[PDB]
Design a protein around this ligand. Structure first.
Ligand SMILES: O=C(/C=C/c1cc(Cl)ccc1-n1cnnn1)N[C@@H](Cc1ccccc1)C(=O)Nc1ccc(-c2nnn[nH]2)cc1
Length: 237
């Protein structure tokens, strides 16, 4: 997260850190708890991942330093990637992880609500991006979970900033014209969370951008409301 600040324990309890163990254990991507056995994340996180056995999901984490060999984690039973997905920049950048065991909800770990199709006209004014990603294009994975409040921009605006791409209706963009606050490397798969009528909604999944926090280059996110039917179908199995 560029231009953000350290979060406090318990303020983003749907946020998880997904680790891979191959070739060695490290943070791979963010994710969001959406059900007792279900993490929603980005499809692009699973490049080269041939088995769910190498994945570990850690919940209730503020600092990566909390994760040692003796720290509890959730195993992954199955990775479900959208069948139209090919790469992040062309969309369908969404995936589900079915956990091996169930998350017992607490103030440290609880699900975020999905957006409603009836809310497509809602102007979300209180949106936050979170994660352990770089704080500059060249930086490193953060110990402490970061947060930044970032304004949504219209898809029409976003398209003008990425004329070499197609910004689709299943994408949503966020950023300042002058830059300075954005997701960055290591934040992908995590949530863009918007508070509306005193409830947090999972509006976006951190997906891609050209550089981090650059002038006239908003961050691009998977537009979650455009996938609620897909999420339902896949979780009903
Ligand atoms: O995490 C991201 C974020 C990309 C991104 C998203 C938005 Cl909304 C706006 C700008 C973005 N960036 C553009 N250039 N950098 N960020 N991307 C992942 C892509 C990816 C994930 C998994 C597998 C392959 C590729 C990444 O680089 N992740 C990442 C994770 C860890 C490290 C890392 N560094 N040191 N140790 N681990 C570096 C990069």
């Amino acid at each position: 997260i560029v231009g953000g600040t350290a979060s406090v324990r318990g303020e983003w309890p749907w946020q998880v850190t997904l680790h891979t163990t191959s070739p060695t254990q490290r943070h791979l991507c963010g994710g969001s708890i959406i059900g007792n056995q279900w993490i929603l994340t980005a499809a692009h996180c699973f490049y080269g991942v041939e088995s769910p056995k190498i994945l570990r999901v850690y919940s209730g984490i503020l600092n990566q330093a909390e994760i040692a060999e003796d720290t509890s984690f959730f195993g992954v039973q199955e990775i479900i990637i959208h069948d139209q997905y090919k790469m992040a920049e062309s969309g369908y950048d969404i995936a589900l992880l079915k956990l091996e065991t169930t998350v017992n909800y607490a103030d440290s770990q609880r699900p975020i609500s999905l957006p409603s199709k009836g809310e497509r006209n809602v102007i979300y004014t209180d949106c936050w991006v979170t994660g352990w990603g770089y704080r500059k294009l060249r930086d490193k994975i953060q110990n402490t979970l970061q947060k930044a409040k970032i304004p949504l921009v219209t898809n029409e605006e976003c398209q003008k900033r990425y004329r070499g791409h197609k910004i689709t209706h299943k994408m949503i963009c966020a950023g300042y014209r002058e830059g300075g606050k954005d997701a960055c490397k290591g934040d992908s798969g995590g949530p863009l969370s918007c508070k509306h009528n005193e409830v947090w909604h999972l509006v976006g999944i951190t997906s891609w951008g050209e550089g981090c926090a650059q002038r006239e280059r908003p961050g691009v996110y998977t537009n979650v409301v455009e996938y609620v039917d897909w999420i339902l179908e896949k979780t009903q199995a």
